[PDB]
Amino acid sequence: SFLPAAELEETPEALLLKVELPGMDPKDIDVQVTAEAVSISGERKSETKTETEGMKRTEFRYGKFQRVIPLPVRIQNTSVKAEYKDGILHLTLPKAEEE
């Protein structure tokens, strides 16, 4: 399956995109570029709370995802920043200065 909350922007001041990668410490996501091809990939591990509590409504079947998305420009592994915050992933591939 895919996501409705996975959208690729590109205001004039960076190549960005939003990702619905909620709750998944750095050890639960992964971001690779492979020939200007930025990869989406992750999985939420078991929240091993109290192994005896309940799951009444547990509608929470999250797993793994091998997304990419083509770009208009060859990237730069370095220059680009990486930060996940309160439930969302944000890696902004900026660009180069063009009229």
Residue 35 CB neighbours (<10 A): 6
Cα–Cα distance for residue pair 32/79, rounded to 1 Å: 14
Resolution in A: 2.3
Q: How many CA atoms lie within 13 A of 5 on its CB side?
A: 8
Q: 1-99, what's its fold?
A: Immunoglobulin-like (2.60.40)
Six-digit token pair at 96? 């180069």
Angle, alpha carbons 80-81-83 (nearest 5°): 155
Six-digit token pair at 20? 């619905």
Place of tokens 């998944």: 24
* Structure solved via: X-ray
Terminal CA-CA length for the chain: 38
Residue 2 CB neighbours (<10 A): 8
